[PDB]
Design a protein around this ligand. Structure first.
Ligand SMILES: Nc1ncnc2c1ncn2[C@@H]1O[C@H](COP(=O)(O)OP(=O)(O)OP(=O)(O)O)[C@@H](O)[C@H]1O
Ligand SMILES: Nc1ncnc2c1ncn2[C@@H]1O[C@H](COP(=O)(O)OP(=O)(O)OP(=O)(O)O)[C@@H](O)[C@H]1O
Ligand SMILES: CNC1=NC(=O)[C@H]([C@H](C)c2c[nH]c3cccc(Cl)c23)O1
Ligand SMILES: CNC1=NC(=O)[C@H]([C@H](C)c2c[nH]c3cccc(Cl)c23)O1
Ligand SMILES: [Mg+2]
Ligand SMILES: [Mg+2]
Lengths: 322, 322
């Protein structure tokens, strides 16, 4: 329970992309050694959009496998599937009763729609608050969601002091947003349309290298870090720095006198070396699922033990008959 | 599982009124002998409005006690508290993903707001659909809610054939709407403002008799059944017929030559005889709670055994990892 953290990714495709891996999971890996961590595959969130059932099940497992292959350690952290812990939807109903309609209407994605698309930020708040979470490591695109979660927790604690932990949001600087390679002002997302700007962890590594070589850059022939003036170039530097461990300024210094072909070739090569061991791990975890299944089953038990107590505390404060 | 029915009442006050008792529970009592029945105290719904916790717990028990005192038979039916069965909120989240935003926006109460006030019709659909319910006995004010429930079930079964039972709505004719005694065009409701037009089951019987004697009537000095021309008079006849078992036309025939004082005096007396045995039963169930508690605990177990299987069927169809 020391420095408890919570985070999750939707099983909405066959592969995470660099945004997920560098903007979220890489932070998780650094945090798990000294933080008590719950890492969730949020399959309940996935069905806000129609999902093919066979694919949804398959992608749930492969999202968890990508956690292990990115270095999440089941001996140090808990990995579980959202839908296996009923407390999430129980708390979501309670929190929705403390969430203003206008609050939810102002959320960016909503602001065709279903109730699920309207209320998922409330389920997201429940996902975090159910585990007495102290810190939430996400990318920048989640900031507005977790401000709602903090507001609703404080509004609830107003009525019922000390019931819910109010979580701090932990959003990195450099990898807060990995951008699409074909449109470097737009964040890398699973729905860019064409995925030529999208780098998937489990895609054929030469296809990813090819996409990096075609990355949009500028006209200045000057490798320097300036995301607002030089989006493409700064993104590439961000990617290379993130997958290598080399600081951006050390890279920019080494790139003095170099052109953009050298920047793309080096980033392509670094990414290829990044994803090759990931793909080998995921392949084995898919071919031999017993290991992954035991991890998720232990995770669910642990998650349930924690989450159910939070729900019973909340229910007791509200005055429900227990 | 034969002719399975489901219905519920909110624990939002210290007493049901005649609307609840005649428009809903009286139908339940007639149905329970040859229908497999689940009767629910829907405490999750109550918190869409802020509730005092001590009161909420106390009113949950007293709503269940009023079920027993109105004749619900724990040997023939299941009585349970909504919040004790997690399946309700699990299915509510799924169904919300199949509910149009405009669908929910068109609901009468919504059409100040919270997400809970916006989404409670979806939780109501889950309440019913979780038990493979074939028939839902409600008053007229619930018709639009249960049309949503039927639509969402059919929309879900469209994707996933045969997963959910589509319930038939069972709404009585005469007691579909018991009207307020001071405003006979408005339905008896817990929030009329002044409760001089509201007849509570557990109020002092002489206070209720006094309210009936002050009931708004017309100017014609003619006792006949015509709800659109004679709202007050038709309501009184509806009430007397419902609490006595005497058909309306037999009563109207007996009232030939009589004035409205006779109608109010007879209805007051019939209601007093109705509520006196109810109050005696509820008093004992409040003073000695062991009986009620065992009923609700057995009910929760039974409800859970059924509802959890529905959720697992739904989850399997969606493609969740089980
Ligand atoms: N381009 C990105 N850069 C950095 N972090 C990202 C990026 N995209 C997503 N993330 C992070 O990944 C986590 C989970 O996001 P999610 O599962 O919604 O992935 P997504 O790529 O946004 O998928 P979708 O397009 O289906 O929403 C969040 O912490 C989010 O901030
Ligand atoms: N005036 C009425 N006449 C007939 N039936 C009624 C009346 N009011 C409520 N009912 C029935 O009672 C059941 C439960 O309703 P509910 O718990 O919402 O009571 P309510 O009186 O409407 O309380 P509230 O004012 O808090 O909504 C429903 O089946 C509803 O149709
Ligand atoms: C459509 N649903 C949806 N879109 C989002 O971006 C969020 C994310 C995926 C999320 C859910 N629960 C969490 C708990 C912690 C951190 C996060 Cl990032 C989440 O939910
Ligand atoms: C604010 N919430 C709310 N208002 C209503 O009128 C409905 C009712 C009380 C209800 C909930 N679940 C049910 C299952 C079956 C039948 C009924 Cl009547 C209900 O819910
Ligand atoms: Mg997203
Ligand atoms: Mg009502």
């Amino acid at each position: 329970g020391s420095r408890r953290i919570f985070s999750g990714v939707q099983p909405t495709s066959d592969s995470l992309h660099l945004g997920n891996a560098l903007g979220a999971v890489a932070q998780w890996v650094g945090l798990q050694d000294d933080h008590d961590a719950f890492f969730c595959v949020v399959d309940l969130h996935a069905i806000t959009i129609p999902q093919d059932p066979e694919a949804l099940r398959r992608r749930t497992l492969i999202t968890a496998a990508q956690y292990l292959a990115l270095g999440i350690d089941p001996g140090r952290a808990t990995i579980f599937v959202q839908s296996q812990v009923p407390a999430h939807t129980q708390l979501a109903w309670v929190l929705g009763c403390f969430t203003g309609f206008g609050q939810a209407s102002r959320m960016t994605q909503f602001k065709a729609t279903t109730v699920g698309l309207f209320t998922y930020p409330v389920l997201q708040a429940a996902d975090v608050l159910a585990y007495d979470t102290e810190l939430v490591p996400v990318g920048e695109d989640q900031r507005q969601h977790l401000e709602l979660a903090r507001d609703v927790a404080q509004r609830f604690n107003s009525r019922f002091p000390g019931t819910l932990v109010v979580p701090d949001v932990l959003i990195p600087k450099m990898t807060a947003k990995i951008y699409d390679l074909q449109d470097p002002t737009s964040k890398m997302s699973k729905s860019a349309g064409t995925d030529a700007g999208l780098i998937n962890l489990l895609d054929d590594p030469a296809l990813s290298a090819k996409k990096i070589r075609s990355a949009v850059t500028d006209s200045e022939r000057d490798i320097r870090y300036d995301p607002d003036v030089k989006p493409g170039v700064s993104n590439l530097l961000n990617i290379q720095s993130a997958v290598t461990g080399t600081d951006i300024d050390v890279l920019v210094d080494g790139y003095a006198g170099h052109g953009y072909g050298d920047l793309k070739k080096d980033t392509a090569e670094a990414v290829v070396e990044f994803v090759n061991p990931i793909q080998a791990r995921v392949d084995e975890l898919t071919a031999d699922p017993a290991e992954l299944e035991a991890v998720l089953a232990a995770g669910a038990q642990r998650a349930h033990d924690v989450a159910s107590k939070t729900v019973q505390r909340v229910y007791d404060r509200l005055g429900f008959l227990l």
